[PDB]
Amino acid sequence: GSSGSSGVRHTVKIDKDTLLQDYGFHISESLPLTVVAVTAGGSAHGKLFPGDQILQMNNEPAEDLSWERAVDILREAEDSLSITVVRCTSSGPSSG
């Protein structure tokens, strides 16, 4: 019975750019890896967005994985990076 927050998980791949010298999107140094910025038309264009919470990185549990560890996964990824995030929105109390 795999069920929970409305937010659905979306597995998207990423890659480093030759001009932006980065994987398009960025990540906060804090423990709770949360998309801080998402290039507009780069590698993580659309695939990700500033506000989501990383759930998996290169086939690894985010819970037992912190920014520090992720920083090593972002570089390790040579061919591509299998990053997964959730898509949840404040629905309910939202008033206008």
UniProtKB/Swiss-Prot annotation:
Part of the whole protein covered: 54 to 136 of 1578
Functional note: Stabilizes membrane-bound GPSM1, and thereby promotes its interaction with GNAI1.
Tree of life domain: Eukaryota
All residue ranges annotated as the PDZ domain in the record: 11-89
Organism: Homo sapiens (Human)
Coiled-coil parts of chain: none
Subcellular location: Cytoplasm, Cytosol; Cell membrane
Subunit record text: Interacts with GPSM1. Interacts with GPSM2 (via TPR repeat region).
UniProt name for this protein: FERM and PDZ domain-containing protein 1
